[PDB]
């Protein structure tokens, strides 16, 4: 069978195909309490019916002030467990595996009141200046990722992904453009990586399953991080037990980015080869032919699909047809697929 | 703009477009009690997110022995109201109108114990011979359609459709091939239509909203019903206040049917023109071009889509693209659609 | 199989499928002598390689002053025979049948010098007033259609189509909006039809093969011709031996026309049913599903494709795929189709 | 504009886009004289009307016994000039540039009589054993490529490509699996490359325009040539003035090849980077998205399309639509494109 529909096993978790629903914020928690709503249930479960191998739930805040907006999903309270337990059970029942992206928006948080970051530097001219986290606060945040991971495990998730990309809190600590700290969390690449290092180690104390980390492989800015920097971080993550690196890019600050089909694939290929780390490719991949080429030419291990899954929830079927192959259909739709 | 995406008003109900999700059994009520399950919620709500103007819920039995299978949805108990109330609230919240198809499988019921029909004539060689309904039993069944309609209203449905097609109970009374009764419910076309006439009148005593009736416009069999007979029934339904006739065909008995794109459209066009009744076209309609042609040439008023919505839940978007036009996307998917 | 790809026989001509390349002017006779050029050869022959059942060559003038533009093809001289003979030989060699549309632009001719029409009435504000043809001039023109038909036969064409549509000379005589004559060629519907009647009879004196006539089934204007008038003309054409009526519409004068997929199909269906005449459907038909629906529901006998064949010369292949069926490919492309 | 539709200049020749019609044998010279036929004219010219930037004419034999079949095109006689001159003139008139692939089938020639190769080793068990070319014959063949190039120049071609791939004569000399010669044309990579070296140098004495060379970048066989070998040959070709290397693979002998979308792209990327040579990518590239990715990620300079151009002669238009961009349409089809 096509590589796109060939299984892969990661830490006891076996995915039936290589299609992954990339995490995408829905801004639909209208009660502003970070809880799930019927919309979220239908939104996610429908792609499970659609045969996506792994569905990654949108950025879920580990602290209420770490939300991007007050409509974001959260996982900062035990009260969030009940809802997530229902979602994981139903997604798995339809045949898919499910993961959750643990997040903290840092200086890009669009909330009232003080927002936090490694240094008091605003995202742009239209944003509020964040408050520099005290060492105590940085360590409490590490514990919040750990506590959130514990809740995710209890809720039944198969995979946990750490959001270290798109200019949010962890990415802010990683890049010299946003981190000007003078303590143990700033300076050398070792110190800039320390926040992520501690998060990974603490999460490992409560979670032994598949662990993914999403990164922005380049800042596309002078004096910022580039692929060489991320190959270095990737080697350190490998040593810590990270199973796969989800390769995105940009958004730390505004930058000129040449966007085209497969524009972020070179990052996934370089990290995979140089860091001997499994990688996820993402970025304007909209058909089965490109997905297959990426996998077959050894550029990545999983194909993350975002916007095409918003246009076509049953992308798996469409891709199978494009590749002239067959895949199992959800039982209820056998007479249509 | 395109007619397919132009609003239409029926009674006090306005549909935002003319695309309808044709009723389709999901055989997913696993507890065998006719109640809804999480799968049903995701299945239906996802097409509401997908912008379908009107979603018609699958055949729902008005009596437990009227189910096609023990895994069918039901509406014979007040215990069914709670679940349906949640479903209608969520589908409408996503922007669509919702209907329910009231049904009774008659001699095609696949259940243990006696099954019923107008006459003791089996569907085929592999089916049990049904019990001829006594006149009182027929009247009790009319009351059950009435009681089911009352529950549908309480649950919040916008439209009610009577299932008088596909060889089920009502169709069985309508056709001389299956109705050999010699009492008030058999013989002349008027008497064969009496059961449906009484159901329509009783339903109208508890429901004043949009009322649709789905028919099989031909039996494709010698001595059976043909389009001329249905044009006649349509005129009577118009007099009774039926708002639209959903035009399907066949299934009373096995028959040779030439299937092709738009194979049932001639039924919708003839009933529309000769009975001055709004009609719904259904049958191998899979793209926006054909849908627009049917509406623009005056062959039907609503376009019912079945299997294409199982392959593409977001058919509305696909059709809009095919017609080189734009439609509103669910707010959450604005950056993908 | 699919009706679209089932053979059909007209007289002594059998078409391998029911797809027809609608006549389309290319304005490529640069020497202004009506002769063919290399571009015409590649343009037409490529659709023969593409498996179109019947290819109809663009409007070819029967008199030099009957051209739409000085870049049009012509068939008014024996000097035109040599070129056409080469074209018919090559198109037929590739497996298709070929026809030619005999024409005269009348008052819509864009040439220097006097132009002719049934009455001295200009097409519009930006057009020259035509000279009213004397009775003798009308008779000379009938002889020119006859002489052109004889040349078409000598050149090897399989079908001859008379252009009686789109506001050109013959259509001008047919409509009371443009024909105000008081002699034998004007007044009653019979007299307005006389010019076409004589052309058909004279052409039949030199041509006994398939004869098509393209009409504009409606003027979409008050006091102008409508489908009822054309059903009448169709009955007369049937009596005269015309084999098929190619159903287009409009262009006699400017008018508001609602265009959409299959907007001219009702004309083909009504003429077919009421005049018992084979018809060709044309007008925004761009896919195999609609083509099959038109044929299966008995709305027309041949499907004429214009613009979609300019976008996709191999539409036959595309349509076959859309209908989930297989057709023979040109031998040279067996490893691609 | 998209890179796929961005120009590129090679030795005074400017291509308007990066789409190239890969050379494809048509086996249509029915007179067995290597001359062009109307089919060839329509076949090639239609893709020029279709806006392909560069059209490469199929393998054309430099010696009659170098044909693959007796139906192949040839360029071994001055009599072939007349026909080619007409083809180049007409393709250029439609807006495209045109090239020709100079070839000699070697041991894969399917002709009666002795066939030639560097060594007496058959292609497979179903093929005739070739005659080992004498040194005199090898040198005469070099002169035939030179003489053929002179004819191509006189005929008006814009580009000349040397066929050194797919197991034909030149490839046979390059690989140790097929070349066991003990003279100056066999042994070391220098001697195995000598035949090609002399062909390039002699062709340069009569042709100063764009020069392409198509190679099979791997034999996919133990002890055969691999990408490392071809990177080496590429460096030598660069020194000799070759402008671009058309990167194909296989066919020297039967081998197990994993075929998938873009399966030969790694060869084009590696040769481009390591030999600093412009390259052409080819192999299961069927859409504009993949074509754009290949160009944008710097994997090749030109995108060669074979089978998709047999299915869709107007691939350029399709690709433009897929990339959401606009390109000029042939004047005659402005109302369709
Ligand atoms: C509406 C929307 C919401 C998104 N939310 C998230 C998110 O919560 N976490 C994340 O890592 N990326 C997020 N992304 C980025 C996507 O996951 C994905 O990486 C990006 O769209 C590139 O892929 P695509 O071209 O397949 O859409 C979002 C994108 C969109 C359009
Ligand atoms: C899985 C499945 C379930 C169906 N269930 C119902 C039903 O409950 N009631 C009904 O009236 N028709 C039912 N139908 C018939 C469809 O509503 C529809 O009329 C038919 O499929 C023709 O349309 P299509 O070609 O768009 O699918 C069902 C069809 C399928 C394939
Ligand atoms: C460029 C062009 C040239 C045409 N030339 C002719 C012609 O010579 N004769 C004719 O009867 N119709 C002519 N037509 C009308 C077409 O044959 C056809 O009936 C019309 O485009 C409707 O079909 P379509 O939607 O498939 O294109 C032409 C149309 C176009 C766009
Ligand atoms: C019918 C046919 C004829 C071909 N003839 C030639 C040829 O003359 N010269 C050549 O170098 N390749 C030839 N090829 C190989 C193609 O040019 C092309 O490299 C191959 O099909 C891979 O690309 P594709 O997937 O885009 O078709 C031919 C392929 C086919 C299917
Ligand atoms: O809402 N969005 O567009 C987002 C949200 C989170 C993220 O990581 C990237 C984009
Ligand atoms: O839409 N859904 O999938 C749902 C909706 C509500 C619910 O309680 C469970 C699942
Ligand atoms: O399950 N099914 O296939 C069905 C069920 C009901 C109906 O009206 C038609 C078909
Ligand atoms: O393009 N073509 O098909 C042609 C061109 C020239 C010719 O003499 C015959 C056919
Ligand atoms: O050039 N054109 O657009 C035309 C030419 C002839 C015709 O019958 C219709 C349209
Ligand atoms: O005919 N064919 O399939 C061919 C011909 C020539 C070539 O280089 C490769 C394939």
- Is residue C12 exposed (0-12), middle (13-18) or buried (19+ Cβ within 10 Å)? exposed
User: Which residue among D3, D258, D293 sits closest to A290, beta carbon to beta carbon?
Assistant: D293
- What are the residue ranges of helices labelled H in C169-260? 169-174, 189-206, 227-240
Q: Does A6 touch chain D (CB under 8 A)?
A: no
Cβ pair D161, D213 in contact under 8 A: yes
C-alpha gyration radius of chain C: 19
Q: Other C-beta atoms within 10 Å of B136: how many?
A: 8
Residue linked to tokens 């009775």: C135
- SS3 for D146? helix
C-alpha distances in Å from residue D127, one per residue of D111, D115, D155: 11, 11, 35
Task: Give Cα D127 to chain centroid, integer Å.
Answer: 24
How many angstroms separate the CA atoms of B191 and B200, rounded?
15
How many angstroms separate the CA atoms of C287 and B286, rounded?
12
Instruction: Kindly identify the ligand whose nearest atom is closest to the C-alpha of C333.
Output: 4
Q: What burial letters (b/e) apply to C268-294, b meaning 16+ CB within 10 Å?
A: bbbbbeebebbbbbbbbbbbbbbbbbb
Q: What is the DSSP string of D223-270?
A: TS--HHHHHHHHHHHHHHT--EEEEE---SS-------TTTTHHHHHH
C-alpha distances in Å from residue B153, one per residue of B158, B200, B208: 8, 15, 9
- Is residue B182 exposed (0-12), middle (13-18) or buried (19+ Cβ within 10 Å)? exposed
> Do the bridges between strand C159-164 and strand C97-103 make them parallel or antiparallel, or are there none, so unpaired?
parallel
Element (H, E) at C161: strand C159-164
Whether B290 sits inside 8 A of C289 (CB atoms) is yes
Q: How many CA atoms lie within 13 A of C336 on its CB side?
A: 24
The closest of B94, B162, B99, B159 to B316, measured between CA atoms, is B94
Q: Other C-beta atoms within 10 Å of D102: how many?
A: 26
Give the length of chain D. 337
B276: left (phi over 0), alpha (psi -120 to 50) or beta: left
Q: What is the DSSP string of D261-302?
A: TTTTHHHHHHHHHHH--EEEE-SS--SHHHHHHHHHTTS-SE
- SS3 for C98? strand
DSSP C166: T
The closest of A309, A215, A243 to A19, measured between CA atoms, is A309
Output helix, strand, coil percentages for chain C, rounded to the nearest 5: 40, 15, 45
Instruction: Return contacts of C222-230, CB within 8 angstroms, 24+ apart.
Output: C223/C176, C223/C177, C224/C175, C224/C176, C224/C177, C224/C252, C224/C253, C225/C174, C225/C175, C225/C176, C225/C177, C225/C252, C227/C266, C227/C267, C227/C270, C227/C271, C229/C189, C230/C267, C230/C271
C22 is known to lie in a ligand binding site: yes
Pocket-testing residue among B24, B57, B58, B71, ligand 7, by greatest number of atoms within 8 A of Cβ: B24
Token pair of D179 as six digits = 């070349």
Sign (positive or negative) of CA dihedral D26, D31, D36, D38: negative
Q: List chain D residues with CB under 8 Å of C311.
A: 314, 317, 333, 336-337
Q: Tell me the CA–centroid distance for residue B316 and ligand 6, in Å.
A: 22
How many angstroms separate the CA atoms of A73 and A151, rounded?
14
Whether D266 sits inside 8 A of A297 (CB atoms) is yes
- SS3 for D41? helix
Token pair of A268 as six digits = 């996934």
- Is residue A134 exposed (0-12), middle (13-18) or buried (19+ Cβ within 10 Å)? exposed
Q: Tell me the CA–centroid distance for residue B170 and ligand 2, in Å.
A: 17
Ligand 4, atom 30: closest residue by C-alpha: D24
Q: What is the DSSP string of B36-49?
A: --HHHHHHHHHHHH
Q: Tell me the CA–centroid distance for residue D150 and ligand 4, in Å.
A: 25
- SS3 for C116? strand
Through-space distance between the first and last CA atoms of chain A, rounded to whole angstroms:
18
**Beta strands, E only, B145-301:** 159-164, 211-216, 244-248, 279-281
How many angstroms separate the CA atoms of B332 and D236, rounded?
57
> Do the bridges between strand C8-10 and strand C13-15 make them parallel or antiparallel, or are there none, so unpaired?
antiparallel
C168 is known to lie in a ligand binding site: no
How many angstroms separate the CA atoms of A331 and A329, rounded?
6
Q: Which of C332, C334, C335, C337 to mutate to test the interface with D (most CBs of D within 10 A)?
A: C332
How many angstroms separate the CA atoms of C60 and C80, rounded?
10
A336 lines ligand 6 (CB under 6 A): no
Q: Other C-beta atoms within 10 Å of A273: how many?
A: 13
The closest of B280, B289, B315 to B3, measured between CA atoms, is B289
Q: Tell me the CA–centroid distance for residue D51 and ligand 2, in Å.
A: 45
Looking at chain A, the residues that come just before a C–N gap of over 2.5 A are none
C-alpha gyration radius of chain B: 19
How many angstroms separate the CA atoms of A210 and A230, rounded?
21
User: Which residue among C258, C266, C297 sits closest to B265, beta carbon to beta carbon?
Assistant: C297
Cβ pair D118, D178 in contact under 8 A: yes
- Is residue A227 exposed (0-12), middle (13-18) or buried (19+ Cβ within 10 Å)? middle
Q: Which residues form the pocket of ligand 4, taking CB atoms under 6 Å from any ligand atom? A: C 335; D 22-25, 58-59, 101, 163, 165-166, 214, 248, 282-285, 305-308
How many angstroms separate the CA atoms of C294 and D32, rounded?
46
User: Which residue among D263, D265, D292 sits closest to A261, beta carbon to beta carbon?
Assistant: D292
How many angstroms separate the CA atoms of C232 and C271, rounded?
9
Whether C90 sits inside 8 A of D335 (CB atoms) is no
Provide the number of CB pairs (under 8 Å) joining chain B to chain C: 49
How many angstroms separate the CA atoms of B318 and B325, rounded?
10
Token pair of A229 as six digits = 């920097």
| All chains having 3 or more CB pairs closer than 8 angstroms to chain B | A, C
- Is residue A126 exposed (0-12), middle (13-18) or buried (19+ Cβ within 10 Å)? exposed
The closest of A296, C330, A290, C45 to D24, measured between CA atoms, is C330
How many angstroms separate the CA atoms of C21 and A212, rounded?
57
- Is residue C78 exposed (0-12), middle (13-18) or buried (19+ Cβ within 10 Å)? exposed
How many angstroms separate the CA atoms of D82 and D269, rounded?
39
Q: Does D289 touch chain A (CB under 8 A)?
A: yes
Token pair of D152 as six digits = 């191509």
Pocket-testing residue among B24, B39, B164, B283, ligand 2, by greatest number of atoms within 8 A of Cβ: B24
Q: How many CA atoms lie within 13 A of B51 on its CB side?
A: 27
Q: How many CA atoms lie within 13 A of D170 on its CB side?
A: 28
Q: Which residue of B has its CA nearest to A318?
A: B311
For chain A, how many structural domains are there in total? 1
Q: What is the DSSP string of B111-148?
A: -SS--EESSS--SSTTSPPPEEPPHHHHHHHHHHHHHH
C-alpha gyration radius of chain D: 19
The closest of B122, B109, B115 to B180, measured between CA atoms, is B122
Residue linked to tokens 């477009």: B17
Ligand 8, atom 5: closest residue by C-alpha: C38
> Do the bridges between strand A54-61 and strand A97-103 make them parallel or antiparallel, or are there none, so unpaired?
parallel
Whether D332 sits inside 8 A of C49 (CB atoms) is no
Method used experimentally: X-ray
How many angstroms separate the CA atoms of D279 and D299, rounded?
8
B25 lines ligand 7 (CB under 6 A): yes
Q: Other C-beta atoms within 10 Å of C142: how many?
A: 20
Q: Which residues form the pocket of ligand 1, taking CB atoms under 6 Å from any ligand atom? A: A 22-25, 58-59, 101, 163, 165-166, 214, 248, 282-285, 305-308; B 335
How many angstroms separate the CA atoms of A291 and A30, rounded?
35
Task: Give Cα C326 to chain centroid, integer Å.
Answer: 29
Pocket-testing residue among D19, D22, D262, ligand 4, by greatest number of atoms within 8 A of Cβ: D22
Task: For Cα atoms B219, B225, B230, give the angle at the middle one, nearest 5 degrees.
Answer: 110
Cβ pair B214, B161 in contact under 8 A: yes
Q: List chain B residues with CB under 8 Å of A310.
A: 333, 335-337
Whether D296 sits inside 8 A of A265 (CB atoms) is no
Q: Other C-beta atoms within 10 Å of D334: how many?
A: 10
| All chains having 3 or more CB pairs closer than 8 angstroms to chain C | B, D
A253 lines ligand 6 (CB under 6 A): no
Ligand 4, atom 28: closest residue by C-alpha: D24
Task: Give Cα B316 to chain centroid, integer Å.
Answer: 20
Task: For Cα atoms A167, A168, A173, give the angle at the middle one, nearest 5 degrees.
Answer: 85
How many angstroms separate the CA atoms of D291 and A262, rounded?
11
Cβ pair A103, A109 in contact under 8 A: no
C7 is known to lie in a ligand binding site: no
Q: Tell me the structure's resolution in angstroms, rounded to a single decimal.
A: 1.4
Domain of B269, in residue numbers: 1-337
CATH classification at residue C161: 3.20.20.70
Q: Other C-beta atoms within 10 Å of C182: how many?
A: 9
Q: What is the DSSP string of C257-277?
A: ----TTTTHHHHHHHHHHH--
Cβ pair C219, C175 in contact under 8 A: yes
How many angstroms separate the CA atoms of A320 and A314, rounded?
10
Cβ-based neighbours of D237, under 8 Å, separated by 6 or more: D196, D200, D213, D245, D275, D277
> Do the bridges between strand D73-74 and strand D54-61 make them parallel or antiparallel, or are there none, so unpaired?
parallel
C-alpha distances in Å from residue A24, one per residue of A21, A43, A170, B328, C314: 8, 11, 18, 20, 41
Q: Tell me the CA–centroid distance for residue D50 and ligand 4, in Å.
A: 19
Ligand 9, atom 1: closest residue by C-alpha: C25
C and B touch with 3+ CB pairs <8 Å, answer yes
- SS3 for C100? strand
Q: Which residue of C has its CA nearest to B283?
A: C293
- Is residue C134 exposed (0-12), middle (13-18) or buried (19+ Cβ within 10 Å)? exposed
C113 is known to lie in a ligand binding site: no
Phi, psi values for residue C99, rounded to 5°: -130, 170
Q: Which of B260, B264, B272, B284 to mutate to test the interface with C (most CBs of C within 10 A)?
A: B260
Cβ pair A25, A316 in contact under 8 A: no
How many angstroms separate the CA atoms of D103 and A128, rounded?
69
- What are the residue ranges of helices labelled H in chain D? 38-49, 79-93, 135-155, 169-174, 189-203, 227-240, 265-275, 288-296, 307-311, 315-322
Sign (positive or negative) of CA dihedral B260, B262, B267, B269: negative
Q: Does A263 touch chain B (CB under 8 A)?
A: no
CA distance B311 to chain A (A): 6
Q: List chain C residues with CB under 8 Å of B308.
A: none
How many angstroms separate the CA atoms of A285 and A318, rounded?
13
The closest of B217, B220, B226 to B254, measured between CA atoms, is B220
Cβ pair A113, A168 in contact under 8 A: no
Whether B314 sits inside 8 A of A317 (CB atoms) is no
Whether D39 sits inside 8 A of C332 (CB atoms) is yes
Annotated binding site of B for substrate: 27, 163-166
Task: Give Cα D284 to chain centroid, integer Å.
Answer: 16
| Cross-strand bridge partners of residue A302 | A280
CA distance D141 to chain A (A): 39
Task: For Cα atoms B267, B271, B272, give the angle at the middle one, nearest 5 degrees.
Answer: 115
Q: List chain B residues with CB under 8 Å of C293.
A: 260-262, 265, 290
> Do the bridges between strand A13-15 and strand A8-10 make them parallel or antiparallel, or are there none, so unpaired?
antiparallel
Sign (positive or negative) of CA dihedral D229, D235, D239, D243: positive
C-alpha distances in Å from residue D125, one per residue of C70, D129, D254: 63, 9, 11
How many angstroms separate the CA atoms of A182 and A170, rounded?
17
Helical packing angle, D79-93 and D38-49, nearest 10°: 30
D54 lines ligand 10 (CB under 6 A): no
D51: left (phi over 0), alpha (psi -120 to 50) or beta: left
Looking at chain C, the residues that come just before a C–N gap of over 2.5 A are none
Cβ pair D319, D4 in contact under 8 A: yes
């Amino acid at each position: 069978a096509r590589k796109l529909f060939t299984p892969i096993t990661i830490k006891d978790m076996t995915l039936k195909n290589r299609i992954v629903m990339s995490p995408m914020c829905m801004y639909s928690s209208h009660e502003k309490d970070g809880k799930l709503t019927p919309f979220h249930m239908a939104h996610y479960i429908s792609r499970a019916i659609g045969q996506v191998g792994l569905i990654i739930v949108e950025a879920s805040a580990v602290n209420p002030q770490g939300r991007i907006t007050d409509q974001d999903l959260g996982i900062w309270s035990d009260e969030h467990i009940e809802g997530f337990a229902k979602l994981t059970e139903q997604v798995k029942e339809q045949g898919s595996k499910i993961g959750i992206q643990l997040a903290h928006a840092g200086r890009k948080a669009e909330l009232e009141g003080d927002i936090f970051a490694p240094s008091a530097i605003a995202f742009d001219e239209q944003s509020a200046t964040p408050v520099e986290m005290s060492a105590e606060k940085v360590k409490e945040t590490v514990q919040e990722f750990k506590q959130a991971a514990a809740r995710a495990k209890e809720a039944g998730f198969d995979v946990i992904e750490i959001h270290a990309a798109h200019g949010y809190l962890i990415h802010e600590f990683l890049s010299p453009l946003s981190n000007h700290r003078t303590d143990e969390y700033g300076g050398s690449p070792e110190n800039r990586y320390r926040f992520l290092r501690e998060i990974i180690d603490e999460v490992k104390q409560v979670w032994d399953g598949p662990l993914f980390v999403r990164v922005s492989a380049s800042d596309y800015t002078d004096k910022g991080l580039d692929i060489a920097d991320h190959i270095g971080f990737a080697k350190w993550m490998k040593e810590q037990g990270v199973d796969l690196i989800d390769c995105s890019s940009g958004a730390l600050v505004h930058a000129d980015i040449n966007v085209f089909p497969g524009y972020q694939v070179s990052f996934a290929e370089k990290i995979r080869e140089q860091a001997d780390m499994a990688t996820g490719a993402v970025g304007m991949i909209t058909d089965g032919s490109m997905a297959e080429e990426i996998l077959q030419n050894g550029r990545a291990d999983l194909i993350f699909i975002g916007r095409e899954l918003l246009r076509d929830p049953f992308f798996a079927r469409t891709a199978a047809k494009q590749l002239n192959t067959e895949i199992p259909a959800p039982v209820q739709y056998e007479r249509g697929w």
